[PDB]
Amino acid sequence: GMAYLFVRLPSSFLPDEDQGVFMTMVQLPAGATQERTQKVLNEVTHYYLTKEKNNVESVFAVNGFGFAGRGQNTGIAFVSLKDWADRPGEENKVEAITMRATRAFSQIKDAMVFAFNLPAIVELGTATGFDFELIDQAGLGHEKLTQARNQLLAEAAKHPDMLTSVRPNGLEDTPQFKIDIDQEKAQALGVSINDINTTLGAAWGGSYVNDFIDRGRVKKVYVMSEAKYRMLPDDIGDWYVRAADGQMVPFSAFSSSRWEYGSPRLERYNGLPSMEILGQAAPGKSTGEAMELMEQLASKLPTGVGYDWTGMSYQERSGAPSLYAISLIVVFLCLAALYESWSIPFSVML
């Protein structure tokens, strides 16, 4: 009976507690814009100040910051709760509140919004959880590896029995306005590339010129295009560059323009390109079983693509219940040597 229940009992690490706090994350799809992610942040802040106003005290919302990394499409919201005392019940603890909210936000119009709890010891992991690096083990490049990664996901979906929520941690590639300077035409017309590239870069990129003092504090000085002339592909031709002729040349007189995809967050693992993948083992089945499967799916990826476990899923080959084995044997030795015997121990040890 004791040997039965033992084997039919789950094995967590430390219980996730209610800490007075929690966080919500907002990721909008790439292309998104600051003002559009603020819409989503409002509807987040709203839910918590109207619907869960018995439990919430403060929402501190940040557009632009993200748990992920910075960018104009991400956000986060820090959420403070009333005292434990002032919210009795289990449906008034983080566990519930995060669930309700996450469900609630599930129908936010095109933006991943996910309320979740602080997990005991963050670096140590989510119990059923794994963290997986796919890798350009030699030469391939972003595109060939995006594909390798797709293959892997697509096929881990085809085992819902063993894996769940296998997903990239990174970002999908998005359109990008490529501009060629035609070197001949420039060098023909009398414009250096130095002035070309400086003009483009300063206007649209911004540029740190030098320091100055504001109320006795040294602070940076920046030059950049007023927002109006820096919003659209067309605005490129607003900008002129002076040749040695003395003559202001249009940008459009030495330059093509075209849309191209590329990554907005290139990630890398031990020195070479990578793509991080997160997921959990399926309910019932354990993580070493999901990890085993993920390695196996991994095995059948194309040439030049490898993998590595990292974070919570990095090396646990340590601890062991072999030191449970020593324990009762050294308990034995000392009951024996107390009772001057070798049958009198088995009396108590049992």
Binding site: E184, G201, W204, R230
Partner: protein
């Protein structure tokens, strides 16, 4: 450690009295060993890679990894990694009235990565719906591309490309080391030990890592081991533990 500190704390004094030429490059402060722990050698089995190609392969896909592998001090590459090697002919340079000065300028000009901001950048005009990066010039990636670098347009409209004044190719950054394994072209990592560490457990890390990379090798590349010091250790332990059971029988 607390002696790298102190050394680095005293090198700060000298730091600025050294020429700016020196202060580019940099000054290392490594806890150094001397002898090599081992030498891993790489060779090619089927003629699909030269001595210079192998070297560049080793540097570009093995040395970095191993120089961070658990235990290792300095690594020494027996050969060099590729560089874009513009080999300029002084005569053809005269023919068009050009100098290495013109060549370097062109190279800085046209092989360059340039930051060009973005559409819909912050601060925006309210109502903006799109935001995307503006990409401009990128670094060149190929010998053809460096060949086509414009140096000057001649009077007749005809152009002086870079391939007109120079031979362009992958080559090493230096051509100083050249290594050979039983007479056969090789490269290799000459691994040093990191100032006290389990040389035995280090070499099994180096070797375990090398296996992680083995399946991604190109056809024909084969790791070989011309100089391990750790087998002597492994055996010398057996031959004193051999005594242990000898003596306890006698």
């Amino acid at each position: 450690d607390i002696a790298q500190v102190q050394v680095q704390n005293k090198l700060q004094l000298a730091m600025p009295l050294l020429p700016q030429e020196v202060q580019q490059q940099g000054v290392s402060v490594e806890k150094s060993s001397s002898s090599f722990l081992m030498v891993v050698g790489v060779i090619n089995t089927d003629g699909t890679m030269t001595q210079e190609d192998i070297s560049d392969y080793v540097a570009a896909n093995m040395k970095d990894a191993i120089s961070r592998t658990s235990g290792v001090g300095d690594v020494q590459l027996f050969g060099s990694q590729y560089a874009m090697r513009i080999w300029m002919n002084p005569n053809e340079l005269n023919k068009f009235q050009l100098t290495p000065v013109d060549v370097i300028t062109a190279i800085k000009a046209q092989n360059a990565q340039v930051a060009a901001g973005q559409l819909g950048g912050t601060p925006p005009v309210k109502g903006q719906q799109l935001n995307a990066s503006i990409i401009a010039q990128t670094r060149l990636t190929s010998t053809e591309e460096f060949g086509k670098i414009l140096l000057k347009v001649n009077q007749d409209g005809s152009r002086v490309l870079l391939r007109d004044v120079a031979k362009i190719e992958l080559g090493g950054e230096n051509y100083d080391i050249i290594a050979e394994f039983n007479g056969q072209p090789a490269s290799g990592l000459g691994i040093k030990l990191a100032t006290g560490a389990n040389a035995l457990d280090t070499a099994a890390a180096i070797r375990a890592e090398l296996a992680k990379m083995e399946p991604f090798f190109p056809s024909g590349l084969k790791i070989v081991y011309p100089y391990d010091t750790t087998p002597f250790v492994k055996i010398s332990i057996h031959e004193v533990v051999k005594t242990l059971v000898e003596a306890i029988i006698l």
